[PDB]
Symmetry: D2
Subunit: 369 residues, 4 copies
C-alpha cells in the first residue's frame, strides 16, 4: 500500500487568458474577466486542500517528467504536436483551434508535464512500486483527439499514458474509465479502431461536444464493441451515477479484464459546477472511487491510476477530489462541509428516465470479449 | 413608452466576504477566495453591458431612494430591522443569521437602496410616468421572510414594493411573479394570509430552501389559494419554463387581474449557473419576458416592474439580463454570443416529468378569484 | 459654475492581459496574474467613488464622443493611426510596439473614446457651456509621441484635445501641464517645434522613459523655450511638488497666457504608488489642483480641463482623484481616510536636493514670451 | 553544503479580509477589494517561483513545526498569547488591535506555523544538519512587540527563533538583522534590555511605525548599545543599501561575534513596492545576501537563517526573493526579467543625504562589546 500523488507548480500557471470561455471580445461586448471558467486556481485549490488536510502525509509524492515527442506520438499526430509548438512560441500564446482552448506563452512545457505526470504515475503503479495513485494534472486531456486540441485539452493525457502502457510496458489490455461530465470524444477517437484500450465515458448527454457520445458510437473494425458511451440526462445525481457504475461500468471492466485501469477523474458532474447540470456530491464521488478501486483489486491486482480531467467549482471541487484521495489512502479525516447543504437538493433517487438511459447500455456488455 | 432603469454604485459594493458560500473556515479547510458565489461583480457586469451595448440610450435612468423604516416595516418586523442595523454597525459587518448571508460594514445603507430602488421604480411606473422598468438592485430579496434575513437577502425588495403599492398607492391587487430558480419562501411567508398580493414562484424543486416550495403551500385564511408554487425538476430548460408560463403563470395573472405585476427577475435558472441545475438560455428568458410584458399590456395597462433577484454566472448572466431589457425597450441590437454553444445542450423538448410537474398546478387556478 | 465630468463604461473594459507589466512568459518564469499593474479597475474605483461620495450630484455628466480620424491626425501621424486600426483587429489584440502596451481586441474603439472624452470636455469648457471639468479617461495618453504608441498610451489624449482647441476653436495659445509622475515624452515630442502649445512636465527624474525629461529638452525652432521639464528626485513629497508649482509651473503659465489649460492629471506620484517613488498625498494633489484652478481663473477665464493620465494604487488613487474633483466643485464632503497614516511618513519638508532641482528651471521662465 | 527551505500551504491561506489596509468601510467610502495590500499571494508567488525555477532541486525542504506556547513565551507575554487564542476563535476572525492586523478564523494555527517554521530552520542550521536556509513564512513578525500584535504581525517570528537559540540551543550571542523597509520596532522592544540578542534594523525613516526607528533608540541597561537603527531617506537604492551594509551592518556583526545570524528578510525596499519609497532591485538584494552569507562564513561557521518579513509587489517580489535563494544555493540559473527596466530608474549612486544618514551610525559601533 503506497499511493502516488502528482502535482507540479506549472499546472497552476496555465494561462487561460482574459475571456470567460472564448476570448474577451469588445464587438460582442464580452467583457474581460480575471478568471476564465477553466482557470487553474480550481485544481490548485484541490492540491492545497490535499496538503492542508494532512492527506499528503499518507501519499508518496511523484515528480512529473515531461512527456517526450515519442510519448505524445503514441496518442497524437506529428502535425498536432508541431501546431502546439507553434502556438506555445507566440509571445502571448493563443487559441489552439476551437476558439475556447487558450494556451499561454510557453504552455507546451505545461502540456508535456501534464501528460508526463500521467505517464510517470502509470509507470510507477505498473511496476508495483505504488499500489495506486492520483495525478492531479492540468491542462486536461479527454477532448483532444488524435489530430487536434479541443475543449481546454492540448494532449490526451490518459491516452498518452495508455499508449505508454501498451508500447513500453507491453500490456495487452488497458481500460480508460472517464467520469468527467463531458463526453470523452478525444479518447474515443484515438482508440476507435483498437480493442486493446477499452474506452468508457459516463457523461451528460450532449453537454460537450454537441454532437457526440451517443450509445451507438461503439468503435470500428476489431475495435467494434470496445468503446462504451453512457449518456445520462441533465439533473442526474448520486443514484444515477452509482446505478451506472453497478449496471454498466464495473461489469464492463470485469468482462474486459484490463491489466491497468486509468480513471479520467473529472469533478464537473458536481452539484455546483457551472459547466454541466448534474447533481453528484463528494459522497457520490467517494462511492464511485471506492467501487472502482475495489474492482481493480478483484481484476488487475489493484493497478488503478486516477488522472484529473475537468471540474469548474473552485468552492466545491476540492472536497470532491479530497473524497477520492481519501478512498485511495483509507484515511478519512475531514468532512465535506457542504454535505448537509447539498444533500437536501436531491439526485438521491433513481428516476425512471435515468434508469432507462443506463439500461440502454447493458446489452452491449456481451460484446466485450 | 418610457422604460425606467435603476442602478446605484453601491449595489456593486456589497461585501460578500472572503468565503465561498459560508465564511472561510480554517478548521474545516475552506480556503478563502476573492469572489464569493454571490459577489456583486455578476450584477455589475449586467449593468455595464446595459451601458456598453447602447441599451441605456433607450432607458430612462431612475435614481434609487433609500427605503425608510416605514417602507421596510410594510414587509418586515421591527426586530428584523433593528438586527440589521446592529450587524451593519459592526466594524467588518458580519453574517445576518443563516450562516450564508454576509452584510458588510455599513451594508444597511445598500439594503435600503436596494429596496428603495424597487419602491421608486414601482411608484414611477404606477403613476404612468413610465410604462415599465427594470430595477437592477443588489442585495436580492425573495428569501427574506417577515422576521429575518436569509439566503443572501436582507430585505424582501419586491414585498417592500408591493407593500408600498398597497398602502401608499391604494392598489387592491398586486402580483409578485418570481422566476428566480430558488423558491421565493420569504415572499410566500410575508403574504401567506393575504389575498391582496398573489405570490407565484417558479423554481427548481428543493434547490433552496431545502424544505419548501411544494405545491401544497397555498396560503392560509383569506389568503388560501393566493400563493402558487411551481416546483420543476432539475434539468428543466426553455421548453419546461415556457410551458409553465403558458399553462400556469399567465393564466394565474389573467385570473387575478392584478393592478401591478412585480417580476422577481433572477437568472440563476440559466444553463451556466453554479447554484442550480436548470437549462434556460438568454432566448428562454427573452420569451418569458415578452410573454409577461404582453400579459400586463392585456390586464393592468402595461404596469409591470422587474426587480433583480439572483443569478451567479458573471460570464452569462449579463446576456440573460440584456435579453429582458431588450424586450422592454423593443430594441434588439446585440446577439447572445453563447447562443449556438448552449443551444446544442438541450432543454428544448418538454419531458414527461417536466410536463407532469407543471400540470399539478393547473387545478389550483380555479381558486384564484 | 458648471463642472463637467466624463466617464464611459468602456474605459473600465481595457484588456491589459495576463502579465504584470510585460506579458506573462513561462520561460522567464513570469507567472500570469489577474491584475496587470495598469488594470482598469484602479480608475474605475475612482469613478465609483465620485458617484458614491455624492460628488456626482455637483457635476454635469458629459458623454464621451469618439475621436474621429481628423481629431487623431491633429496629434499623430497617419501611419500610427493606420497601425492602430490594424492591431485592433487581432482576435485577442496584442502589444502595439514597446512590449508593455497591450491593446485588447476592438480596442481602438476605447482609444477613440478616451481621446474623444478629452476633446468633448475641452469643447464644452472652451465654448463656455461649462466652467471646468474632469475627463476620467482610459487608456492614458502622455507617452504616445507623434508616430507611436508607448507606455500604455495609444493616442495622446491631451494633445488631441490641444490640437482641437487650436484648429477648431481657434485658440492661439494652449498649455498642457502634466503632473503624472512619469515624463510626458509623447506630448513633448508632438509639440517640440511649436510655441502655440506650451508643454510642461513635472516628473520623477528618469522614472519612465529612462533617457528623457532632462531640463535641457527645451523644444526647437520656433518652439525653443516652449517645453519645460521639471525632473524631481525620488522621494519628493508635497513640499517639493508645491514648491515646483509656486516657483516654476504657475509662473510659466502666467508668463505664457494660455487661453486654455489642460492638466494631464496622473496620481502615480502618490505615496502608495508601485510605479514611482514619490510621496504626494491626497491633500498634496488637492493643493496642486486648487492652485492651478485659481491660476486659470486669473489668466484664461477659468478655462481648465483635467484629463486622467496614470496612477496605479487601486487603494489610494480614488481619494487623490476625489480631492481634485472636490476642488473643482467646491464641495468638500469626505475625508481622506489615509490622511493621518500617510502624513506621518514625511515629504512635507522641502529638502535641499529637491529645492535645487526646482531652481534649475527658474532661469528658463524668461524665455517664455 | 545543505540549504534548508520552509514553506507551508497555510502561509498562503492567511485571510487578510476585504479591505485595502484597514477594513472596508462604507461610511468612509473605502470600497471592498479582492486583494488587501498584505494578501498572501505575494509570498506564494515567491514560493512557486522557487519551485518552477528549479531552485527547489538544490534545497532541502523542511516542514514547519507549530510553535508551542513555551516557544512563544520566549518572545511574548502570556497575556498576548492568551489574547491571540481568544481572537482566533471569532467566526470570521478580526483585527487584533492596531486596525490594520487581521487574523482570520482559526488563524492562530497559521501564526504558530509561521513562528515554528523559523524555529525549525534555526534548529537544523544551528545543530549543523544544514549550513543555512530560508524560511518563507507568513504572517510576518518584526512589528509585534512583547505584549501585542502590530503591523500585520501576530508573533515575532525571528525573536521566537532567537529565544529558542538562546534558551534551548545554549547560544550566548544571537544577531537579528532586519532589512524589511519598515522599522523592526517589535524586535527592538523584545530585546531592548538584553545584550545577548543584537538587534539591527535598516529601514526607511518613519515609514512605519510613524514615531520610531531613530538612531537614538539604543536599548537600555545591560542592553544599551545592543540595538542599532539605520534610518535611511526615501528614494534610497542599491548604493545606499550596500554602503549601509559595508559601513554599519557587517562591521556591527563582526564586532558582536554572534553564534547565529537571523535575517529578517523583507523585500518591501524594492523599486516597485507600494508600501515604501525605496529603490532596491533584485541585484541589490542579491549583493546584500552575498555579503551577509560571506560574513557569517567568517564569524559563525556560516550559521545564517533567513526568515521572510514584508514585501508587497506580487509582480517583483518573487525575483527579489529568488536572488537571495540563488545566493544561498550558489546556482544562478534565471535572470531578473525586470533588470534593465529598473536599472535605468537610478538609486545606483550614493547621494550625500544617504551617505550622511549612514555615517550617523558609525560612532555607535564602538559600544558593541
Ligand atoms: S503538499 C505540500 C504543500 C506545501 C508545502 C509542503 C507540502 C508537502 N509536500 C510533500 C511532503 C509533505 N508536504
Ligand atoms: S469490478 C469486478 C471485477 C471482477 C470481479 C468482481 C468485480 C466486482 N464487481 C461488482 C461487485 C464487487 N466486485
Ligand atoms: S450606463 C452609463 C455608464 C457609464 C457612463 C455613463 C452611462 C450612462 N448613464 C445614463 C446616460 C447614458 N449613459
Ligand atoms: S396574461 C393575459 C391576461 C388577460 C388576457 C390575455 C392574457 C394573455 N394570455 C395568454 C395569451 C396572450 N395574452
Ligand atoms: S455616477 C452614477 C453611478 C451609478 C448610477 C448613477 C450614477 C449617476 N450618474 C449621473 C447622475 C447621478 N448619478
Ligand atoms: S497663475 C499664478 C501664477 C503665479 C503666482 C500666482 C498666480 C495666481 N494665482 C491665483 C491668484 C493670482 N495669481
Ligand atoms: S516546490 C514544489 C512545488 C510543487 C510540487 C513539488 C515541489 C517540490 N517539492 C520538494 C521536492 C521537489 N519539488
Ligand atoms: S563580516 C565582515 C564585516 C565587515 C567587513 C568584512 C566582513 C567579511 N566578509 C567576508 C570576508 C571577511 N569578512
Ligand atoms: K477502443
Ligand atoms: K466522460
Ligand atoms: K398571498
Ligand atoms: K422562484
Ligand atoms: K511646445
Ligand atoms: K509628467
Ligand atoms: K538588544
Ligand atoms: K527593518
Ligand atoms: Zn468536463
Ligand atoms: Zn436564486
Ligand atoms: Zn505615469
Ligand atoms: Zn515591511
Amino acid at each position: 500500500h503506497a499511493i502516488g500523488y502528482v502535482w507540479n507548480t506549472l499546472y497552476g500557471w496555465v494561462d487561460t487568458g482574459t475571456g470567460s470561455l472564448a476570448a474577451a471580445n469588445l464587438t460582442a461586448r464580452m467583457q474581460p474577466i480575471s478568471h476564465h471558467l477553466a482557470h487553474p486556481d480550481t485544481k490548485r485549490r484541490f492540491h492545497e486542500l490535499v496538503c492542508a488536510s494532512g492527506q499528503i502525509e499518507h501519499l508518496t509524492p511523484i515528480a512529473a517528467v515531461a512527456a517526450t515527442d515519442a510519448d505524445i506520438l503514441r496518442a497524437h499526430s506529428a502535425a498536432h504536436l508541431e501546431n502546439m509548438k507553434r502556438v506555445s512560441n507566440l509571445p502571448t500564446g493563443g487559441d489552439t483551434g476551437d476558439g475556447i482552448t487558450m494556451m499561454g506563452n510557453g504552455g507546451l512545457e505545461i502540456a508535456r508535464l501534464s501528460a508526463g505526470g500521467a505517464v510517470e504515475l502509470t509507470r510507477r503503479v505498473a511496476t508495483g512500486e505504488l499500489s495506486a495513485g492520483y495525478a492531479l494534472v492540468n491542462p486536461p486531456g479527454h477532448h483532444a483527439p488524435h489530430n487536434a486540441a479541443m475543449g481546454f485539452c492540448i494532449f490526451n493525457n490518459t491516452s498518452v499514458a495508455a499508449g505508454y502502457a501498451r508500447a513500453v510496458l507491453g500490456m495487452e489490455r488497458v481500460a480508460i474509465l472517464d467520469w468527467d461530465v463531458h463526453h470523452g470524444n478525444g479518447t474515443q477517437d484515438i482508440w476507435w479502431n483498437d480493442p486493446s484500450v477499452l474506452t468508457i465515458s459516463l457523461h451528460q448527454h450532449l453537454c460537450f461536444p454537441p454532437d457526440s457520445g451517443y450509445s451507438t458510437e461503439r468503435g470500428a473494425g476489431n475495435g467494434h464493441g470496445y468503446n462504451i458511451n453512457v449518456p445520462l440526462p441533465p439533473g442526474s445525481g448520486n443514484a444515477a451515477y452509482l446505478h451506472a457504475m453497478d449496471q454498466v461500468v464495473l461489469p464492463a471492466l470485469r468482462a474486459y479484464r484490463p491489466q491497468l485501469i486509468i480513471v479520467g477523474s473529472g469533478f464537473d458532474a458536481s452539484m455546483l459546477d457551472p459547466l454541466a447540470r448534474m447533481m453528484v456530491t463528494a459522497d457520490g464521488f467517494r462511492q464511485m472511487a471506492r467501487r472502482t478501486i475495489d474492482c481493480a483489486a478483484d481484476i488487475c491486482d489493484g493497478r488503478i491510476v486516477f488522472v484529473q480531467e475537468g471540474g469548474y467549482s473552485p468552492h466545491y471541487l476540492p472536497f470532491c477530489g479530497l473524497a477520492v484521495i481519501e478512498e485511495l489512502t483509507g484515511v478519512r479525516s475531514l468532512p465535506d462541509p457542504y454535505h448537509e447543504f447539498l444533500a437536501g437538493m436531491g439526485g438521491n433517487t433513481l428516476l425512471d428516465a435515468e434508469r432507462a438511459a443506463i439500461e440502454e447500455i447493458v446489452p452491449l456488455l456481451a460484446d466485450i470479449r
